[model samples]
Target: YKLICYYTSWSQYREGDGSCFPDAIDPFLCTHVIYSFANISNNEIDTWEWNDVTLYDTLNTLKNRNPKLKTLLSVGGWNFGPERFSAIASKTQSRRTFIKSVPPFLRTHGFDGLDLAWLYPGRRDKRHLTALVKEMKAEFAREAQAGTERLLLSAAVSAGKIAIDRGYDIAQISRHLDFISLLTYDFHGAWRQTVGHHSPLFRGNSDGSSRFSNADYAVSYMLRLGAPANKLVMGIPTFGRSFTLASSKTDGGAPISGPGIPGRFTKEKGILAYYEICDFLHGATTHRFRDQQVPYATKGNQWVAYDDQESVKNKARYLKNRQLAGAMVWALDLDDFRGTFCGQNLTFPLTSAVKDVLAEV
Candidate 1:
């Protein structure tokens, strides 16, 4: 089983954003580390081009310590949005020009391949997104014939039904991608006025939305929509979606005032890193909805929806039973990197539960 981890570049360069550095990563916990958000600017790898050169060198060097490890450059992310890729991919000349630099740059940086994280494509842009992947793959084939390594082509895809159908021609998109990472988290957030699970395994009857939303539904829907289950890597969160409730009821559909208090480390309201959530859970009154098989907690007006070791183990076991690729983490740095909150806690305990159930070392 492969545990794919994402490393956000902001962690290393932005002083207050986070504290994890390249050297802080434990190569043993992951099989692939995709250095996030290599920027795509003017149709080329830009923004931190030189920084990528240095950072990639720093990351890929870990391969010597762990032979099976592979590093990839994930271009585009939530922050990058959707317009530029849509423009570049839709135009043949632009696509060709942009893609021409990808292989050489990836090879030069020692990245195993490229992961396209196009936050999402709108309904009208679905075909363009498919064309982009197909074109990129075609370029890879051309390079392969010339004796370059055949680069992997993968994508980070949406989990919701309407979003999937609107953004992807799965039948066309799936065939070209090496694998597709289904963002199984973020089912709900403070953006919503209602309280609900952020990443539920199964949607309980009372889940009361237009339809049930959950990781199980997302994967099943993808498979039904022509995406190969084997290529699907379930995404898990290393953080929690939280909110401030009108009352401390902590039940689904409960009214809320606003986002939960920010974490000591994350410093972001509405969400907390797993470690911050973990510390928040220590004295809070916990509740579990057996029907949905999700857990939550409340401390005063602070309410959070997050995963613990037990939940992760269950989700990993679900993957094992479903025969999916494995788990994909949004980030490695979001967890307790310095072991402050989870003191004397086993290193990567939540992810360790993943390895335990998936039987991966």
Candidate 2:
């Protein structure tokens, strides 16, 4: 399994003050590294063109410092919609224009390949997306055939059925790219009317059906649809979701008031970030759901659903059992720095546990 570390906002706040590379090298473990958003709104390919220059400089420094690091540029994200893509991908001229620009971009940035983070390509128009992927693959193939070494092409996709149905045709699409990263988290969240497992193995009773939860459901769904296990990366969230219960009696059932719920957890409070929840755990209370491999806590009528080392271990096992490509974390920033959540540091716990599991496998 190749451990790929991802970062966004190269010029903004970043891990280790944007200098986490080389110095924090653990090359024996991690193989690929990704930086998000090659071109985005407000900062189009022109607005912050200089930013790319700076980014390239940094990447060059890192690459020179660590010869083993394979860097890739990830475009689009959750917030960045497919507006520009729809325009560029709808016509052959625009597609060619974009493809022609990639070589110069690659040479300038010192990147190995590109990772498309288009959240929902065809949710609005399937016809355009079909053309987009086809064009992208043709471009990638052209570049690859021209002797580009390890010029990988991959994409990050949503795990929901709606995204599956509306987005690219997975089976046909998989043949074009090297692999796909399936975002498995954010299934049940604070936005729901009730408290539910963040990444449960089985659909909780509160979900009203036995249809959701379990990494198997997602992996199986994708495989059934033609995604190769070796080319699929499962995404895991490093954070947790919090909810405000109506009363003590409804504490463990479901979040009565939260972000996802109609009248549930108000978005005003926002879901307590993972690090904040770790802090909360120290002062608040803690409870473990052994069977579910999850943890929760309540203080001042607030409830939080989070994953721990054990949960992550289980998830890694699921990944291994299914022979999936590898596992990925949403972001590295939310890890517990002080070992407050599970009486141990968050990233260390998760990564070390995963390493151990992989070692045995």
Candidate 3:
């Protein structure tokens, strides 16, 4: 089982509370650690700034501690959207451009390979997407034949079954990459008028109002689509999404007109770092929704749907029982990174649960 964790460059700059830089990562917990949001620019891997190189060095140096660790550079995040992704894949020249530039750039920067997180492969761009993956696979073969260590290639895939079908050529996709990160969280978010579990195991009783909304359904669909269970890594959110109940209600089925008020530490719309959630849950009554198999905290009109150690245990066990590769955290920065605020008594308690459960595998 591979425990992969993503590190966000933007998170490195946050002034306080859960702010994380590359040096802060716990290498022992994960087999692979990835740096995110490097973009395709001038047909070359765009170095966002000088600090990117500085931080890249900081991450690579950590390999001396955990020599088995593999670091990867992730490109084309959600902010880039599908057009930039499809634009790079639409023409043969663009594909060639990316291939020619990226491999060497990865080696130069000390990254082991590339992680293509192109928000999604659009509905109409499946063929282009498949072509990109196929070409990259062939490129890897050529690199190996030339006596170079094979570079790993993987993609962050959609969780929605429909999005999976329309956005990916499943058989070909599953066949090409070294791994596939199924974004199992974000089944529902502030965008939804009604609040739902951010990530759930089963479809559960409350999701009658929703459709195609659970990690189990997504993973099962991937297995049916010929995805190797060993290549699938379930995504676990270390952060929580908050909501403002329509009235004084704070149950799972309550009406939520929009995101909750911004968190004190996170200062983001509807999202709270796990530490912040722990702080919010202090002395507040929390409930475990039986059907959802997850816990939530409520106070007056404020509500947050989030995962605790129990949820991480539940998901990690699912990964083991399903014989899946492992679980991936969105970004380690979102967890109770400092250990002071969260009541878990240990830093990275959520990740700790994952490590313990997967260790038994």
Candidate 4:
């Protein structure tokens, strides 16, 4: 059983309680902590932030507290774009340069592994993705044979059907990866005018694209595509996708004008951190989707779909029942790390719920 948590490098720049430093991490909670978005430059892995070296040192030092914990460096994110990933993986020499750069960089930075977060490869680049992963695994294994521990390799893959079908040859890539982190959230948000839960456990009765928008369908589809049940780490977001209602309707499929107001700390319109949502819930009318298995809160024209302690525990039980590898949180910073805003006086409540429930089963 694994509880893998991701830490975004940029989150350190947030203000007040939203800001998180490497030292703030309670290393004992997560079995593995993957640092997000290490950059790719000249077809080689490199650091993005100016303070990353110091940050890496601080984050990696947590291993002293918990010798069993693992730290990984992730490259590529939505901002990195598919074109950049394709550029590096398109040719043998490019792939070789990138592959050779990984092990040394990971070692120097005190990381035990590397995670690829190529947002979504297109049909044209699918084969190249498989090749890249296969070759990387080969290189890591070769290096390990020469008297070093084998570095772990994982990919944050798409949960959407179209993206999965176009971007991955699941069984082919699954054979090479240590595990796959399935991004099962972000199914609906301010980008659309309709309101829907971003990460519902099960899909409610709906027609068209909505049918494939839930975690159940996503997991079932991956299983059908030959992904190993034990090597799949399902994603649980530490944030919510919010919207500004166009009308009084508050349920799913309600009309929306645009994204909701930005949070005080994250300052991102259409999105709110779990901590921010705690503040938003003061007078907000909350309702749960009994059939779908999640909740949403609406305060006036602002509506947000998010997961809480109860829903996450439900997801943990679901994953355990399905025999998945473990749970992976999109981030540690976005949750109520400070424990002040949520009023429960519990730090990392969402993550704690997953750990506690998984421990029981």
Q: Write the per-residue lDDT of candidate 4 for residues 1-361, one digit (tens) a residue.
A: 9988999999998987789987888889999999988888888999999999999999999999999999999999978988988988998998999999999999998899999999899999999999999999999999899798799999999998888998899999999999999898977742568888889888776546566787888999999999999999899998998888999988667998888899999998888999999999999999999987899999999998999999999999999999999999978999888888898788888899999988997
Identify the leading candidate in terms of TM-score: 4
lDDT of each: 0.81, 0.63, 0.83, 0.90
Question: In candidate 3, what are the lDDT values of residues 1-361, reduced to their tens digit?
Answer: 8988998888876767556788888878788988987878876678764599899999888898998899888888867767877888887898888887887788788888889888877688898888988888888778778687788998888898778888788888889999999998878753567767788877787457555778888999999999999899999988888887887666656788678787765688888888788889977788886776788888767788899998888989988899998899877888876777876468877887888899976
Q: Which residue pairs come into collision in candidate 1?
A: none
Predicted structure 4, TM vs. truth:
0.98
lDDT of 1 by residue, 177-253 (tens): 88888899878752567788888888787746645368888998988988887888999887788888887566677
Clashes of each: 0, 14, 0, 0
Q: Which pairs, if any, clash in model 4?
A: none
Worst 10 residues of 2 by lDDT: 259-268
lDDT score for candidate 3 against the true structure:
0.83
Q: Pairing residues by index, what is the TM-score of model 2?
A: 0.82
Stronger candidate by TM-score (1 vs 2):
1
Give residue 218's error in model 4 in angstroms. 0.9
Regions of model 1 farther than 4 Å from truth? 13-18, 47-50
Query: Pairing residues by index, what is the TM-score of model 3?
Result: 0.96
Provide the global lDDT of candidate 1 against the true structure. Answer: 0.81
Ranking by TM-score: 4, 3, 1, 2
